[PDB]
Homo-oligomer: A and B are copies of this chain.
Amino acid sequence: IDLGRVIGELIDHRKLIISITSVFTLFAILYALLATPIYETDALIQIEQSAPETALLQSRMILGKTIDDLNLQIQIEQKYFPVIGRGLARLMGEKPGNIDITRLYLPDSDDISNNTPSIILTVKDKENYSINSDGIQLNGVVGTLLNEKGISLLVNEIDAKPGDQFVITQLPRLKAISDLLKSFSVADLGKDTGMLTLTLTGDNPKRISHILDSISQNYLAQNIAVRIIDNAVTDPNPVRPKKTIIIVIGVVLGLIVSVVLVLFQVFLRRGIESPEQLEEIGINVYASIPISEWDTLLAVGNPADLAVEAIRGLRTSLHFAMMEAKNNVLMISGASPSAGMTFISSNLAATIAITGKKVLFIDADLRKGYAHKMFGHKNDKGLSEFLSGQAAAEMIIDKVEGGGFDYIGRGQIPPNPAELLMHPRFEQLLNWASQNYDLIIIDTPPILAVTDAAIIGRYAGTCLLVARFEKNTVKEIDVSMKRFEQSGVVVKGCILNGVVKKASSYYRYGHNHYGYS
């Protein structure tokens, strides 16, 4: 590997890299724009030590005095059904509603798990409201207290629009103190001075300042039975979330994920990349057919296609490689199915037929052949019917419409194709056709699947394999050629099919293909 290789691999997978990075950045931006802002307030306390004073400030005594003073055991949250409703409501510019409660006494279910009883309050107007705990609907009025169904509730100054819902929870005193202690910190700022820097974070900028003022005043009143230099004020800029660092982390995470995925794909790739890989082993590659992006013959629908140009190059190579051959029969086979054998055989027959030569195309794939469908057919009396003795050599030959060559179809699918192909009638047909045609092209099944290609290849002067660009492997093609040669069939060379242009291929070998029109 080198700089050219890595740059080419990054250019090839650019769509994957961009998509993954964009998804990660979109998630990061959504989180940074929908997360609830958290504000911070601070105060300054002067001590005439401070090491016992920190633990006395963070003690349940002071914190619970604050909880009782400010009624922090009553928890009120506006109801947004999804996990993004609050964020989108804040983004839409809707101000958050709030209600003032000074008295709340729930029936204290106190079951095994739900230690915090909760109700839902729905606002009907500026004055009245509705309450439902477990489906039990009640109606209340601001001002007058409610004592019904074992529930005591006092709501004042509803500041919201009608239809809003609020979840009212009565959490235990220790839970409230634990929350306050989790959001409250004390420092010394000099490690020796009497200055104490109290800090408190929360999602309500006014409430956190009120809470910190209450804490400071309670501590002062306790200690005088300590000077407050700065009363608590809230920094208007939220301390969390940190949007820029969140987005940067998202970008970097997306980039590293994309890079590792690309590396895994590159290292797990095993297919053929260029004809040079085949020619290292000693396999002559006679053509490289590109992918045609255009049941019709390509060489007839679009004679000016790049794939048909590559097939004409293959025809020119064959006109020289097929001389000094024992006969005029050419067999095209391959390693794996759907490698391009029928495509290449049919289009090669078309391109050789337009040059004024008589061509016969035999579809000796007695299992899954569709040449009759691709050419327009009379399905009766095919190769199977001829081989099984129930047809003559003259009634099986047809004419391609937009072609210019004859063809023989597979007929009906037999139960014994490999035993049919061993009959001497096949060699009789080939010997008869070699005297009436200038070229016979035989299409065969793969060799790594069945043995029909190796049975047929005995009567074929020239045999070529078709290798798929990314699917097949060099070892696979070597295995196919050695299995052919083990049965007495000499494979002339190979044909790489379905080639596409890649930047890594350019930085390793080169272009090796152009357009000229």
Interface residues of chain A, those whose CB is within 8 Å of chain B, are 3-4, 7, 44, 46, 51-52, 55-56, 59-61, 93, 95, 112, 115, 174-175, 189-190, 192-195, 229-230, 233, 235-236, 264, 267-268, 270, 284, 286, 303-304, 309, 312-313, 315-317, 319-321, 336-337, 354-355, 367-368, 415-416, 418-419, 422, 445-446, 448-451, 454-455, 473, 475-476, 479, 483, 486-488, 506-507, 509-517
* Nearest-CB residue, chain B, relative to A267: B3
**Cβ–Cβ contact A59 & B511, under 8 A:** no
**Cβ–Cβ contact B3 & A268, under 8 A:** yes
A-B interface, 6 closest residue pairs, ranked by CB to CB distance from nearest: A449-B516, A449-B514, A52-B193, A320-B488, A476-B510, A313-B451
**Which residues from chain B contact A313 at a C-beta distance below 8 Å?**
450-451, 454, 483
**Cβ–Cβ contact B55 & A515, under 8 A:** no
**Cβ–Cβ contact B190 & A52, under 8 A:** yes
Q: List 9 A-B contacts (CB under 8 A).
A: A3-B268, A4-B270, A52-B195, A56-B195, A303-B416, A312-B418, A313-B451, A320-B487, A475-B512
A402 to B501, CA, bound (A): 44
CB distance from A454 to the nearest CB of B (A): 5
**Which of B189, B192, B451 is the one whose CB lies under 8 Å from A309?**
B451
A270 to B7, CA, bound (A): 13
**Which residues from chain B contact A175 at a C-beta distance below 8 Å?**
236
A60 to B41, CA, bound (A): 13
CB distance from A251 to the nearest CB of B (A): 21
CB distance from A174 to the nearest CB of B (A): 6
**Which of B233, B315, B475 is the one whose CB lies under 8 Å from A174?**
B233
**Cβ–Cβ contact A230 & B446, under 8 A:** no
**Which residues from chain B contact A516 at a C-beta distance below 8 Å?**
337, 367-368, 445-446, 449-450
A356 to B444, CA, bound (A): 24
**Which of B229, B236, B445, B517 is the one whose CB lies under 8 Å from A367?**
B517
CB distance from A409 to the nearest CB of B (A): 18
**Which residues from chain B contact A488 at a C-beta distance below 8 Å?**
320
**Which residues from chain B contact A52 at a C-beta distance below 8 Å?**
46, 190, 193-195
**Which residues from chain B contact A479 at a C-beta distance below 8 Å?**
510, 512
**Which residues from chain B contact A304 at a C-beta distance below 8 Å?**
415
* Nearest-CB residue, chain B, relative to A286: B486
**Cβ–Cβ contact B174 & A517, under 8 A:** no
**Which of B115, B194, B367, B510 is the one whose CB lies under 8 Å from A475?**
B510
A384 to B422, CA, bound (A): 37
**Which residues from chain B contact A316 at a C-beta distance below 8 Å?**
451, 454-455, 487
* Nearest-CB residue, chain B, relative to A476: B510
**Cβ–Cβ contact B510 & A115, under 8 A:** no
A62 to B513, CA, bound (A): 79
A512-B309 contact, Cβ under 8 Å, with A46-B52, A55-B193, A229-B59? no
**Which residues from chain B contact A509 at a C-beta distance below 8 Å?**
475
A336-B112 contact, Cβ under 8 Å, with A4-B267, A268-B3, A454-B313? no
**Which residues from chain B contact A510 at a C-beta distance below 8 Å?**
270, 473, 475-476, 479
* Nearest-CB residue, chain B, relative to A46: B52
